[model samples]
Target: QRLCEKPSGTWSGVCGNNGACRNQCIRLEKARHGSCNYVFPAHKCICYFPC
Candidate 1:
């Protein structure tokens, strides 16, 4: 499956730990404005303030 193909090492922390693993990018099917990116470092996964 495609899920198994993902490189786990690329992820910095636990995906469900409430404070780990970054959501670095978001892919969009269609082009949109205002930067469709949601980038942030792994440590900021649970950031209280704006990243």
Candidate 2:
């Protein structure tokens, strides 16, 4: 299934903890899932949902 992604607006600082990001994403953005990018110096919390 296709997915949609967007950066979290409420999350700040390093996104090494996906669980925390996921919680906020679901509550704040109504996302189905949330993950962090592995890129160095840019660990963004990316929220995902059905497309």
Candidate 3:
């Protein structure tokens, strides 16, 4: 499963490469790992795991 977020609440939101927000998702049991990207005018974070 995968879930996405822009937690910074802005289009320019930036997430850490050290898996800052990603870690939270892991802690929340949302996923075992995470990935982030700067998608043009915005930033994105994705947590992934097997269903």
Give per-residue CA lDDT, model 2, range 1-51, as digits (tens). Answer: 568888888887778888889888999989999888666667889888888
Per-prediction TM-score to the true structure, in the order listed: 0.17, 0.77, 0.48
Model 1 CA lDDT for position 14: 35
Residues forming the 10-long window of minimal summed lDDT in candidate 2: 35-44
Off by over 4 Å in 1: 1-4, 8-10, 17-51
lDDT by residue for model 1 over 1-51, one digit each (tens)? Answer: 111122223334334432222233112211111121233433212222121
Relative to the unseen true structure, what is the C-alpha lDDT of residue 45 in candidate 3, on a scale of 0 to 100?
Answer: 62
RMSD of each: 12.9, 1.7, 5.0
For residue 22, model 3's alpha carbon misses the true position, in angstroms, by 1.7
Tell how far residue 51 is off in model 2, in angstroms. Answer: 0.8
Q: Which of the two, 1 or 3, has more lDDT?
A: 3
The digit string of per-residue lDDT tens for model 3 on 2-50 reads 3444333221246656376567657764566666666667556656565
lDDT of each: 0.26, 0.85, 0.54
Better candidate by TM-score, 2 or 3: 2
